Every structure is written in C-alpha cells, then in structure tokens.
C-alpha cells in the first residue's frame, strides 16, 4: 500500500494472508484475502493462475506481521481452490478475478471467532456504495512501486470510490474497466494499493455493515495520477459465490 498507516489485525480481523511453500524450505507471501464464512476465504484468481496446486499454499488468519508470528494466528491448508471459469487477462485488466479457498486446519476445522479473526459481510445483489464513499484497503503489498520486498507490518489506507464514467475516460483506462469492476483512488493520488496487495479487501460501509465491496485486482503503476486501482465488483459475483459456498 503506498501511503497508509501501519495497523494490526485487530483492525482488519477478516484479512487472510496466503503463502506458498517451496521445495527448498522457504514460504513466500502470495496475496491477501478475506474470510466470508468459517471455512471460506475469497481472494483473486490471478494470484493462483500460474500455480494452481492447492497443497502448496498455506493460509494464516490473525496475522499482523508477514514473516513473524502474531499470538492468536491460525494456520490452514487449502481444502478446495476454486478459480473463475471465464478468467482473462489482457494488457492491463484481469476479468472475473475472484477465487475461493476452502480452508481446513490440521485438526479438521475451519476458523474460530477471536479478537483477531472475524468474517466480513457480503453485499446484497448488485448493491454498492455510491461513488464518493471512502473505503479502506489493507495488505502487505509494496510501499513504493520500485521496492522488491514487502513490509513486515500490515498497512491500511483509505481511498474513495469513483464512477465508471470517470475511470473509463480515455486518459484513465478507457473500456478496460467494465461494469464488473470498480475503481478507487485518492483525490490527490497520494495513497493506493499496489503489487502484493492483490486479493485483499476494499471494505466500505453499506446499509450499516462493513462490507467487502471489492477485491484488489489491477492498476497501472501505484499511486499514479489518473491511474486508479481497479477492483473486482463483488456485488456482481454473488450468484457465483453462492453456487460454491455452503454450511458453516
């Protein structure tokens, strides 16, 4: 996240950190995600696309640091990895960039409620905040697009939602942004999501609840003028989410 503040998971208790294991001894961070229900985390397909081998990913909940433990953190394996059929990437945008990960603990359980682990809410069918709403994004992504490492502390920032008319203007992204995407930026292009923040949440308050409005998906550069961050429009994927999620 460029700009922002450093936070702890108590402030984003539904944030999930996804890592991949290497036949060598190292685990590296891949992307962020959000907890929807006890056993399901939602992230972005492009984070898995290149290596869809579920057994090599590990998911941690209750995590405030990247490679050091946080007391209260829970570790899970990916029991199911569901990528979106119709997922596409062009020279910028990713289309239908949403993925579901069913988690299982080594003891056979899903997440448990704590002060650092909570679920986030889902919007109702095609329901979004209006452009102008200030939403917050969180993640361990880059702090500068030229960095080659990720911060060790979780960060958060606030961005405002912008209309499609503004984002589809030629000097922004043209028709690369579709109705199934959302754009968010800082009025003064000072803070924004960036690489390593993919899959994480764009949370806004809708009808009283803190709702997962978008998933970090792409952007041209980070915190670049007239280059907003583009997010997957969750309110438009509800059927798809439903047809794959069940029980507690």
């Amino acid at each position: 996240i460029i700009g922002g503040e450093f936070t702890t998971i108590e402030n984003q208790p539904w944030f999930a950190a996804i890592y991949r294991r290497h036949r060598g001894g190292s685990v590296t961070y891949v992307c962020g995600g959000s907890l929807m229900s006890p056993c399901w985390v939602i992230s972005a397909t492009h984070c898995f696309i290149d290596y869809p081998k579920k057994e090599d990913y590990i998911v941690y909940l209750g995590r405030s640091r990247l490679n050091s433990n946080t007391q209260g953190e829970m570790k899970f394996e990916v029991e199911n990895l569901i990528l979106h059929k119709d997922y596409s990437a062009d020279t910028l945008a990713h289309h239908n960039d949403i993925a579901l990960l069913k988690i299982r603990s080594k003891e056979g359980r899903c997440a448990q409620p704590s002060r650092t682990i909570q679920t986030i809410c889902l919007p109702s069918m095609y329901n979004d905040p209006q452009f102008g709403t200030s939403c917050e994004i969180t993640g361990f992504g880059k702090e500068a697009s030229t960095d080659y490492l990720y911060p060790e502390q979780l960060k958060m920032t606030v961005v405002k939602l912008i209309s499609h008319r503004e984002c589809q203007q030629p000097h922004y992204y043209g028709s690369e942004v579709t109705t199934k995407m959302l754009c968010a930026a800082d009025p003064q292009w000072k803070t924004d999501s960036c690489q390593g923040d993919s899959g994480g949440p764009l949370v806004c308050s809708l009808q009283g609840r803190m709702t997962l409005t978008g998933i970090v998906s792409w952007g041209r550069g980070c915190a670049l003028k007239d280059k907003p961050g583009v997010y997957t429009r969750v309110s438009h994927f509800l059927p798809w989410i439903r047809s794959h999620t069940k029980e507690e």
């Binding site: 108590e10 402030n11 984003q12 208790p13 539904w14 229900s37 006890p38 409620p113 002060r115 909570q118 679920t119 986030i120 809410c121 889902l122 609840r209 803190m210 709702t211």
Partner: peptide, 9 residues
C-alpha cells in the same frame, strides 16, 4: 464468541 460479520472488537 461467534462470528458477527464486519465487527472489529
């Protein structure tokens, strides 16, 4: 206690 979506504590 139990999950209350969207709640920070």
């Amino acid at each position: 206690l139990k999950f209350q979506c969207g709640q920070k504590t």
